[PDB]
Design a protein around this ligand. Structure first.
Ligand SMILES: NC(=O)[C@H](CCC(=O)O)NC(=O)[C@H](CCC(=O)O)NC(=O)[C@H](Cc1cc(-c2ccc(-c3cccc(Cl)c3)cc2)no1)CP(=O)(O)c1ccc(Br)cc1
Ligand SMILES: [Ca+2]
Ligand SMILES: [Ca+2]
Ligand SMILES: [Ca+2]
Ligand SMILES: [Zn+2]
Ligand SMILES: [Zn+2]
Length: 159
């Protein structure tokens, strides 16, 4: 259930960049992660560099100014706030992970899909093939698809 955005145009901004990947690969992973969700809802996402974005994307370490301190390498990979003003919507990625484009380390795209689900108001799935299942798993990103449960969940919130 959860809170939802009360509009269908949502902006995001990348506050800072992990040194683990180059800038263009970070931008690509995030853009594609938003596209997964826009593909099955009325939502549209635009990246901005200037202005007040709804969803701020942040890489940070350990205790980083909120109530969800990170824990070093492993364990919690990221956390995101549900829809709302201010820190609402924002997605934080633990810099103590090694973010990648691929299967090594922690794949940024797949983690971002999961986190953006939370930023849009989804909770966890019991479907062990759903991207909103609680625990990270690498799957071939070239053939990645939302599960029927993920699509059901997001279409129940928007549209
Ligand atoms: N246990 C694991 O598998 C990895 C280990 C990471 C490592 O050791 O490198 N860690 C994890 O999975 C940890 C577990 C955290 C925990 O419960 O203690 N999860 C987290 O770190 C959550 C963040 C997270 C989950 C994922 C994810 C999940 C599923 C899939 C996927 C893709 C395709 C198919 C399938 Cl079946 C699954 C891909 C990525 N990506 O990010 C934390 P969060 O859910 O945002 C959260 C919830 C509540 C609060 Br309150 C704060 C944050
Ligand atoms: Ca961690
Ligand atoms: Ca916000
Ligand atoms: Ca890192
Ligand atoms: Zn945080
Ligand atoms: Zn989660």
């Amino acid at each position: 259930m959860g809170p939802v955005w009360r509009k269908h145009y949502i902006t995001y901004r990348i506050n800072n960049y992990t040194p683990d990947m180059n800038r263009e690969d970070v931008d690509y992973a995030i853009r594609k992660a938003f596209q997964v969700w826009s593909n099955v809802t009325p939502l549209k996402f635009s990246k901005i560099n200037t202005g007040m974005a709804d969803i701020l994307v942040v890489f940070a370490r350990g205790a980083h100014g909120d109530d969800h301190a990170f824990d070093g390498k492993g364990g919690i990979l990221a956390h995101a706030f549900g829809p709302g003003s201010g820190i609402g919507g924002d997605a934080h990625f633990d810099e103590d992970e090694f973010w990648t484009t691929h299967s090594g380390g922690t794949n940024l795209f797949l983690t971002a899909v999961h986190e953006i689900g939370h930023s849009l108001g989804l909770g966890h799935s019991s479907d062990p093939k759903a991207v909103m299942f609680p625990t990270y798993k690498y799957v071939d990103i070239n053939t990645f698809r939302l599960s029927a449960d993920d699509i059901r969940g997001i279409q129940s919130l928007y549209g």
